[PDB]
Design a protein around this ligand. Structure first.
Ligand SMILES: [Mg+2]
Ligand SMILES: [Mg+2]
Ligand SMILES: [Mg+2]
Ligand SMILES: [Mg+2]
Ligand SMILES: [Mg+2]
Ligand SMILES: [Mg+2]
Ligand SMILES: [Mg+2]
Ligand SMILES: [Mg+2]
Ligand SMILES: [Mg+2]
Ligand SMILES: [Mg+2]
Ligand SMILES: [Mg+2]
Ligand SMILES: [Mg+2]
Ligand SMILES: [Mg+2]
Ligand SMILES: [Mg+2]
Ligand SMILES: [Mg+2]
Ligand SMILES: [Mg+2]
Ligand SMILES: [Mg+2]
Ligand SMILES: [Mg+2]
Lengths: 76, 188, 57, 135
RNA sequence: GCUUGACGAUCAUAGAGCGUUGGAACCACCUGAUCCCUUCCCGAACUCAGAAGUGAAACGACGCAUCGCCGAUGGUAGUGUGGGGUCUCCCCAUGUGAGAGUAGGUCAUCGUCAAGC
RNA sequence: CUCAACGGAUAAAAGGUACUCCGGGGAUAACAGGCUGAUACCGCCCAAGAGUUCAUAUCGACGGCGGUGUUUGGCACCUC
RNA sequence: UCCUAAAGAGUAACGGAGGAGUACGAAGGUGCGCUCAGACCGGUCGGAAAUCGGUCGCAGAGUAUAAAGGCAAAAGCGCG
RNA sequence: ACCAAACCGAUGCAAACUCCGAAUACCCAGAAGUGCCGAGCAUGGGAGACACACGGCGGGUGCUAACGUCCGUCGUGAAAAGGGAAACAACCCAGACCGCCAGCUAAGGUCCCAAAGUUGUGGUUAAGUGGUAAACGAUGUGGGAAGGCUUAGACAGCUA
């Protein structure tokens, strides 16, 4: 009947773009259910949050069947 | 049916709008089977005589690019929607042997006296026009004559009723459909 | 070679971005002519601020 | 009048009315048409004032198509009401016209009986509408 | 490169449909279920013991653009900065430039060994 | 600890003033002005029709474009 | 949770629409298996519809709970 | 003789609909030049502010009404004088250290108030348009490209 009541905007998005250099446990993408899949050396935590495990450069490559988006980190 | 052209070595948006107000020209292209596409300027006055002609759409037109001559058939008319006038033309080279689909007008030649008109309630409603073609360019169908002087009331006309004379096919019969053409019904 | 430029408009109603393209060339005020080393990245600043300038060669 | 049967929502934004009309500017069914050369918006009672003008200057036959359909609800606040206590109720329905759009089509009549019939329907519409033929 | 298997590379120009075709090597159906083992019932599936038969089915190759899928050139829509006008909308200079549609394409291309030439 | 006035004044809290009072404010209302014209008012375009025939002697349904600031408003720029 | 929100984050209105103040000792872990809805044909008391068999499917089903974003190593279903 | 799923063909439209899809804006790296001699970051001392205003471009609301009102982003006022718009915080031009009876320019201008062309060239417009306004009406006029008939006699008028 009356309607205000929004929420407080959880600050999602994609950090660490296509040519960065990452540390051991950085946050790559704050996902909301797998826009991006776990590529070569990344983690996929509890609420589908991609994080690194090794060092290098982010790739953002599209692979395979289903055309899914794979975030791999390359030792380069 | 004859028209002469030029070369148009200036592309883009800005150079393509100065043509239409300074010199009154219309852009075009000539793309075909064995050659490259070639852009072209034409005048708005000379296309106006051809577009006013009846069967000029389903007909071979010669083109003088420079002194270059080519038998050219027209399949597009981009047209200005607001005021109403011609924009760029986009026609086609004609090879002496190629399959060459195009579009053909209709006429409905004999409907002054029909069985549904003079006996029953008289209405004839033309649904379709501009039926396509798929024919070698050695024989050009300028038009197709359809006769509805004998079809009674309550009957419709499919595409199988009218015919395509002397080596002409119909693409809609090459698919699994047969579109209705004309109806005869009762007025209200 | 080089090319000389001439600041022919004022800087006091402009953006925060054209006002730094002109300062990157080295122009301080109106009717002030400098020489630039005509690299591909020094003539990229000229293409932004083309209307404040008189590129008289 | 002409309005949807049921709607997924109830009220809608205003928006704008930009651009020309590239799809909608070609005559498809009839052989004469009344296309619109000025932008505006039609309020679904003007359509019935213009339909009932064409359907009594013929009285013999022909066939009429109505190419445009209003689906955009508009609001109106009541009187002696200050501003800001919500949003007003839906009073009527609006189609949005932009230059080139074809409004009515006719066929099965003469070339000049129809020409003086769209003169009647143009005097009920708030737009500058022209006369066009099938090619 | 040709033959069949295994594992990949690349994800439709590699798909679907139709047609055609293969053995005694491979593979598949097949024969039994006593002996492992299995079925909310059932040797269907799972598994074991095998070589009576077959290439039907399946599976590979080989053809067809009929559906699908890719897709030019030109024009057009929109838009950054600077100016305009009759200023709820557009226009000029300049940089940028789709989507849709058209001409046409497509019955994929490779790599690693093991058994065949 | 429905401390839900959800960063939570205290273990523990309802109302009247036309008998009124002090400090302020045109950061804010009622009167008149200002900008606006939905409404109001005088008009004008198509003309189904009735005026026994005959749309325009007089009216004119369905709808459309303007003018004046005259009353019902909208806003809160001036003056507490 | 969505829209306004201008293709990074953020962002107002007494702006348009909806939900929560919980369940669960398996509705958790693991190993092993397995696919939907719907249409249609045939089949006794059911019949537009129950259970069974069949082809067609190509996720249009499902997700303890709103909507959004997801799901074939199925994040969906069964067993130890 | 009404009606009507579903399917085929043509045909339109959504802020809470997407098979698609830019310009810009954002990030990170590698370089040349310029920075008024610094631009950045960190630690300390001292504050003021937390009533905003208009204009341009995207929007909500409103009647796509208000110098209305709530946002996004640049600009000006606030805290900026000078020249222009007759006078006109917020629009165009340009940012005042002081002195000069010195010169060249910007927007705006050049008959007289009023500083500078009664300048040159090619046409238009007779209404004081210029120097306020809509549907709509009309042998106003200038230009353009096509037509319709015509010395076999057209169009007008005068006679049957
Ligand atoms: Mg300043
Ligand atoms: Mg394209
Ligand atoms: Mg008393
Ligand atoms: Mg007092
Ligand atoms: Mg006040
Ligand atoms: Mg005040
Ligand atoms: Mg965003
Ligand atoms: Mg943005
Ligand atoms: Mg679960
Ligand atoms: Mg599994
Ligand atoms: Mg959208
Ligand atoms: Mg405060
Ligand atoms: Mg405040
Ligand atoms: Mg204000
Ligand atoms: Mg205010
Ligand atoms: Mg100074
Ligand atoms: Mg001088
Ligand atoms: Mg003087």
């Amino acid at each position: 009947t009356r309607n205000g009541r929004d929420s407080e905007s959880k600050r999602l998005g994609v950090k660490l773009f296509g040519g960065q250099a990452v540390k051991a446990g950085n946050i790559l993408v704050r996902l909301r259910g797998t826009k991006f899949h776990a590529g070569y050396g990344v983690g996929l935590g509890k609420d589908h949050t991609l994080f690194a495990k090794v060092d290098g450069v982010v790739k953002f490559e599209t692979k395979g069947a289903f055309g899914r988006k794979y975030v791999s980190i390359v030792a380069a | 049916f004859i028209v002469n052209a030029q070369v148009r070595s200036d592309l883009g948006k800005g150079a393509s709008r100065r043509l239409r107000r300074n010199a009154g020209l219309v852009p075009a292209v000539v793309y075909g089977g064995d050659k490259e596409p070639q852009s072209v300027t034409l005048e708005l006055r000379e296309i106006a005589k051809l577009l006013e002609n009846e069967a000029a759409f389903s007909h071979v037109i010669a083109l003088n690019v420079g002194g270059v001559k080519e038998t050219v058939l027209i399949k597009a008319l981009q047209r200005h929607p607001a005021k109403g006038f011609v924009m760029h033309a986009d026609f086609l080279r004609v090879v002496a042997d190629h399959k060459l689909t195009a579009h053909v007008p209709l006429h409905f030649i004999n409907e002054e006296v029909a069985v549904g008109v003079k006996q029953a309630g008289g209405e004839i409603s033309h649904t379709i026009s501009e039926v396509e073609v798929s024919c070698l360019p050695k024989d050009l169908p300028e038009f197709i004559e359809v006769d509805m002087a004998k079809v009674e009331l309550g009957q419709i006309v499919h595409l199988s009723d009218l015919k395509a004379p002397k080596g002409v096919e119909l693409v809609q019969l090459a698919h699994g459909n047969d579109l209705a053409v004309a109806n005869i019904h009762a007025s209200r | 070679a080089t090319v000389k430029v001439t600041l022919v408009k004022s800087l006091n109603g402009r953006l925060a971005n054209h006002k730094a393209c002109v300062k990157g060339l080295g122009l301080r005020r109106i009717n002030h002519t400098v020489e630039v080393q005509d690299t591909p990245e020094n003539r990229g600043m000229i293409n932004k601020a083309y209307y404040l300038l008189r590129v008289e060669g | 009048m002409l309005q949807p049967k049921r709607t997924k929502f109830r009220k809608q934004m205003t928006g704008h009315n930009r651009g020309l009309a590239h799809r909608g500017s070609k005559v498809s069914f009839g052989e004469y048409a009344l296309k619109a050369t000025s932008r505006g918006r039609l309020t679904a009672r003007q359509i019935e004032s213009a339909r009932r003008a064409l359907t009594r200057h013929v009285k013999r036959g022909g066939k009429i198509w109505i190419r445009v359909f209003p689906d955009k609800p508009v609001t109106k606040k009541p009187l002696e009401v200050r501003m800001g206590k919500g949003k007003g109720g839906v009073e009527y329905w609006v189609a949005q016209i932009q230059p080139g759009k074809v409004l009515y089509e006719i066929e099965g009549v003469s070339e000049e009986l129809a020409r003086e019939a769209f003169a009647l329907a143009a005097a009920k519409l708030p737009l500058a509408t022209s006369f066009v033929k099938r090619t």
